[PDB]
Design a protein around this ligand. Structure first.
Ligand SMILES: Nc1ccc(-c2ccc(F)cc2)cc1C(=O)O
Ligand SMILES: Nc1ccc(-c2ccc(F)cc2)cc1C(=O)O
Lengths: 278, 278
């Protein structure tokens, strides 16, 4: 009674990137049923495609196995790529609890292979728990200031002096569990090319493959702290250490005090397709 | 390139019971790829149907998102029910690392709706950590002796004086994480009808819907401690508190010192069907 696809977001090859399940024609499902379906699937998120209510192309509801989210990065990227198979539009306007998100779809011979999204503009401040966090991560200091960004989820950024040092992290996940309602993103790199690892007991993931909602904030962080300029894109490679390499591209336009746009893009690929009996 | 089904094991209605993904015609998949697929699906287990090697009907390999298992209860029950759609045999002999498991399939008009399995005969001993475990569970004492059973996984049983007392448990899951390589099964009831709740940080589940490998051991536990006789079946209802009610039926034949058969049965239902591109 409902068709779905499994999209690996921020990947061009199946079994890379970050999976999301996308359910079509979901207007007949009450939200309690959507939540039960997301629990059944047990993917980080399942999304449901609904008729639009405010002039967009579709309304997307986003569920983890436990609760509904107002916005999420890789789930929305994967939803846009899944829906691109059922429309010819170059642009896709997806309504969410946080407003209407604009996507640009990139096709080859009718197949959507990538998409770019405008993200909510983040806010940020110092975390103020540096010694506790560094101890949990097993290191003595960060390179750049340890700041926490909010764009729906909360993302903390800790900088490492080299990619080898980032790969060598073995965090104490018990100690990280004292950091509620946030994800810890550790990064290293230079110029256009950065590496990331994300850990979040609060969001139910030991180590994440592709934290799409962290890519925009990271571009802002790098620009604020002088490693890139506002208006310059970065390529962020995540999930290497867990065998789910994921490429996220991000750019923040404006200046710190007046951000005009935060763009995140990536490839996506279909892993599977099916139908559920409900 | 591979078809799969999602079976809700120990349920007759979708979104009840415990899901397992079953992949058909998997002989072309190397085990590293099977493991990557199980990680992609992120269900408690994915199983893969292979040609038999020792005279059975099929060889089943069982993967969690992280590792391969030699045996598992609800995953094998769901596999037998999924495969029943592709055979006419009344009995199904499924090879596993722990040997060939015999299943009896129950059909209505060609559809397999339930199955019974013979399980490995468990061993057991006192846990010897009673005060620590009771404190983690938030209670002062068990009804029956706290014993740990081994049949592949390890299952501890803690008895509660009433079903209301079982439903009222709010375990300290941090404290339960100090119990490695085992699941904690709390039970209550009388006569033929028992209720269970299972918690296992070690096996990556906060609270499980249907712990099929615990049902055989529970029947043995109840018989040893005089609540039933050997040779009498019990009906175990699990997962009520998490909205995944699951009915498991179990019977242990013989006597404690010479068990001849441990049978577990349940309904199963198809939640979805699909195909993956690998
Ligand atoms: N994987 C995720 C898990 C949780 C959240 C989140 C969003 C809004 C909010 F208010 C709280 C949490 C986002 C993501 C993501 O992928 O962006
Ligand atoms: N959900 C499960 C998770 C783990 C195991 C397990 C099996 C063999 C072994 F040696 C260790 C662990 C079984 C189940 C099950 O459902 O029976």
């Amino acid at each position: 009674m409902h068709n779905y696809v499994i999209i690996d977001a921020f990947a061009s090859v199946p079994l890379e990137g970050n999976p999301v399940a996308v359910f079509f024609d979901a207007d007949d499902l009450p939200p309690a049923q959507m939540q039960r379906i997301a629990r059944e699937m047990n993917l980080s998120e399942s999304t449901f495609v609904l008729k639009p209510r405010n002039g967009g192309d579709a309304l997307i509801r986003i569920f983890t196995p436990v609760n509904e989210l107002p916005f999420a990065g890789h789930p929305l990227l994967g939803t846009a790529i899944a829906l691109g198979a059922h429309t010819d539009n170059h642009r896709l306007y997806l309504e969410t609890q946080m407003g209407t998100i604009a996507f640009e779809l990139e096709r080859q011979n009718g197949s959507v292979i990538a998409a770019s999204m405008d993200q909510p503009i983040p806010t940020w401040t110092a975390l103020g728990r540096d010694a506790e966090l560094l101890k949990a991560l097993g290191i003595s200091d960060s390179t750049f200031p340890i700041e926490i960004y909010h764009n729906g989820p909360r993302h903390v950024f800790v900088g490492l002096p080299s990619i080898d040092a980032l790969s060598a992290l073995h965090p104490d996940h018990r100690a990280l569990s004292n950091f509620h309602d946030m994800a810890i993103n550790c990064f290293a790199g230079a110029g256009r090319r950065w590496r990331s690892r994300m850990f979040s007991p609060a969001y139910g993931v030991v180590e994440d493959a592709a934290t799409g909602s962290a890519a925009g904030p990271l571009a802002i962080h790098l620009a604020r702290h002088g490693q890139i300029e506002f208006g310059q894109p970065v390529e962020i490679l995540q999930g290497v250490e867990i065998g789910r390499p994921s490429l996220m591209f991000a750019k923040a336009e404006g200046r710190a005090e007046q951000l005009t746009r935060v763009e995140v893009s990536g490839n996506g690929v279909t892993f599977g397709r099916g139908t559920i009996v409900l």
